[PDB]
């Protein structure tokens, strides 16, 4: 039933795209790379995400499948490549759930600073497990309402920031362009800080690439693709740019209340801080509670999605058969147990601190997302090259790309350099060891090992250009 208005679909997409990067990670990014560097990094990440999502939408429009981009990777490059991509996606979702739990524990502070957050995290995990094991019937309505609330609070924050920056209400001065130029230039640090915050910028924009897959369900994508592309792209870019600009201008970079490895005291989200420092009491608590509820809902939704995708993967012959067993109600049990066991990683805050664990989880999630983006870009490039070699007419494609091969190449190069320049200084110095390399780069060795093992155990090679599936299938 397509009874929902186009505005309703647009706002649902906006709510789904908005995550925890703008709520918490924005302050850390501003404190690390400054306002201008963060703006440039986010603009580049947005352009790359736009190109990748356009290519994915074209791929979905040309040939629709029910196995997502994993099937394309398996059938266009190699089966082991798709297997590794699927396992990396599952691990990325698990790391995202762990990061959501850590963020909930962190934002739980500033109200009761005299009690460890381990108990709160354990209680939240238990509540999520109970909700997942009882039923999952109210998922859609709760998700829609939470997305609406998130959109409302984001637009309220944008409006109040725009009212404050110029200065209309009494009792507060107008900072103007003073917090921007102070000591160091807005562009602070350099190449190292830029590539460091590039991981966070990429993590923030992850999850919005799947909308094109939804656009693959349209009967006539020819006119449906441009409208959705324009609406979603423009709205997301405008909201992100305005929010980041407001946060950077209204908050100095040298703020002790921002997330860092060495923190003098507790850290709070910029959204709460704006109301707290504005002199309006009894108003930051409601926003903090809304943030907590949104984080809890996002974590529950992610856990449900990870359990469902693990069950779907176990349905085929990839995963071992000791996962598809279901109870009398049909709800999987082994997959939920595995998800809980993997998500129990959030208990290391009591032994390694709060900021470091959150940063490591963000880095791991960003690296997994970057690996997935590289895989999908390579698959799209190989598919287009094979179609061109096959001699098929270009007008038969329902959709296409503007600049080729400028799209796939630029995104691939940018992603590769961002991934490689994260910890380049380790090899420069005399100290090499293995602690830093293992701490920073952990998804790449696992991906390489899985791919090598699958190739050795299956004896498979690349797919010839003249021997590939070209004719689309109708479902």
């Amino acid at each position, epitope marked *: 039933r397509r009874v929902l208005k186009p505005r309703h679909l647009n706002m649902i997409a906006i709510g789904g795209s908005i995550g925890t990067g703008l709520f918490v990670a924005s302050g850390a990014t501003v404190a690390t790379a400054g306002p201008g560097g963060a703006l440039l990094s986010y603009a580049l990440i947005g352009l790359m995400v736009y190109f990748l999502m356009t290519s994915l939408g074209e791929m979905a429009a040309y040939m629709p499948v029910s196995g997502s981009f994993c099937t394309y990777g398996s059938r266009f490059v190699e089966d082991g490549f798709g297997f590794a991509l699927g396992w990396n996606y599952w691990y990325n979702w698990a790391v995202t759930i762990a990061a959501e739990l850590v963020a909930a524990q962190l934002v739980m502070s*500033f109200w009761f600073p005299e009690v460890p957050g381990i108990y709160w995290s354990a209680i939240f995990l238990g509540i999520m497990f109970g909700l997942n094991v009882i039923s999952a019937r109210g998922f859609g309505e709760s998700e829609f309402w939470f997305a609406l609330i998130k959109v409302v609070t984001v637009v309220i924050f944008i409006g109040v920031g725009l009212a*404050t920056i110029f200065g209309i209400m009494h009792g*507060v001065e107008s*900072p103007g362009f003073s917090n921007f130029t*102070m*000591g160091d230039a807005p562009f602070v640090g350099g190449f190292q800080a830029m590539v460091g915050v590039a991981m966070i910028a990429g993590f923030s924009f992850q999850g919005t690439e799947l909308i094109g897959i939804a656009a693959g369900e349209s009967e006539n994508p020819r006119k449906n693709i441009p409208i959705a592309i324009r609406q979603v792209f423009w709205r997301i870019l405008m909201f992100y740019i305005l929010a980041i600009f407001v946060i950077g201008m209204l908050i100095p970079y040298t703020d002790p*209340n921002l997330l860092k490895n060495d923190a*003098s005291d507790i850290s709070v989200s910029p959204f709460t801080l704006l109301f707290e*420092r504005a002199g309006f009491a009894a108003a930051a608590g409601v926003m903090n509670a809304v943030i907590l509820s949104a984080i809890l809902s996002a974590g529950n939704s992610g856990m449900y999605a990870s359990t469902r995708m693990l069950y779907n993967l176990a349905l085929e012959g990839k995963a071992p058969r000791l996962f598809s067993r279901v109870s009398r109600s049909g709800v999987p049990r082994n997959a939920l147990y595995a998800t809980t066991l993997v998500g129990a990683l959030c208990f290391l805050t009591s032994a390694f601190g709060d900021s470091t664990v959150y940063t490591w989880l963000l880095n791991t999630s960003g690296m997994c997302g970057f690996i997935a983006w590289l895989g999908i870009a390579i698959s799209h490039y190989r598919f287009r090259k094979g179609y061109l070699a096959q001699g098929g007419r270009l007008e038969d494609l329902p959709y296409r790309a503007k600049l080729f091969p400028f799209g796939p190449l630029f995104a691939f190069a940018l992603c590769m350099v961002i991934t490689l320049g994260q910890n380049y200084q380790a090899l420069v110095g005399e100290r090499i060891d293995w602690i830093g390399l293992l701490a920073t780069y952990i998804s790449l060795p696992l991906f390489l090992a899985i791919w090598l093992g699958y190739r050795w155990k299956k004896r498979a090679r690349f797919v010839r250009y003249h021997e590939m599936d070209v004719s689309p299938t109708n479902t």
Partner: nanobody, 120 residues
Framework: QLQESGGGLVQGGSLRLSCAAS????????MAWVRQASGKEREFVAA????????NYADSVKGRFSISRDNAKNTVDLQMNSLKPEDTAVYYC????????????????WGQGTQVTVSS
């Protein structure tokens, strides 16, 4: 809310004074030090954000006092050099809340203060 320490009797050398804050302080922007004499109008001395990107002084005391912060005790320190008998007064460590470094002799939060006197 605010505490000051380091005062005493100085013959005219150099001395550092420290100011510390109580809990919360997550709704604040930057601190300042303001002097006043016995039965005299309050006079601004120095101001600085907690993070510390700029410092603001007074015209008559430019180039002689240095205001900074210390992470060992997480306290705002002011070093006074070339102290003179004309500076005998009581200092108040204050702070302001907002988005801009507020100047002037008017502030919201006030402390106990410390009296400094110089002998010949």
């Amino acid at each position: 809310q605010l505490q000051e320490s380091g005062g005493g009797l100085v013959q005219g050398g150099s001395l550092r004074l420290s100011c510390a804050a109580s809990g919360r302080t997550f709704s604040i922007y930057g601190m300042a030090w303001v002097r006043q004499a016995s039965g005299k109008e309050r006079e601004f001395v120095a101001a600085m954000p907690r993070g510390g990107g700029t410092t603001n002084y007074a015209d008559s005391v430019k180039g002689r006092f240095s205001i900074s912060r210390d992470n060992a005790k997480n306290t705002v320190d002011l070093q006074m050099n070339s102290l003179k008998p004309e500076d005998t007064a009581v200092y108040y460590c204050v702070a302001d809340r907002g988005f801009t470094l507020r100047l002037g002799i008017q502030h919201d939060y006030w402390g106990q203060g410390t009296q400094v006197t110089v002998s010949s």
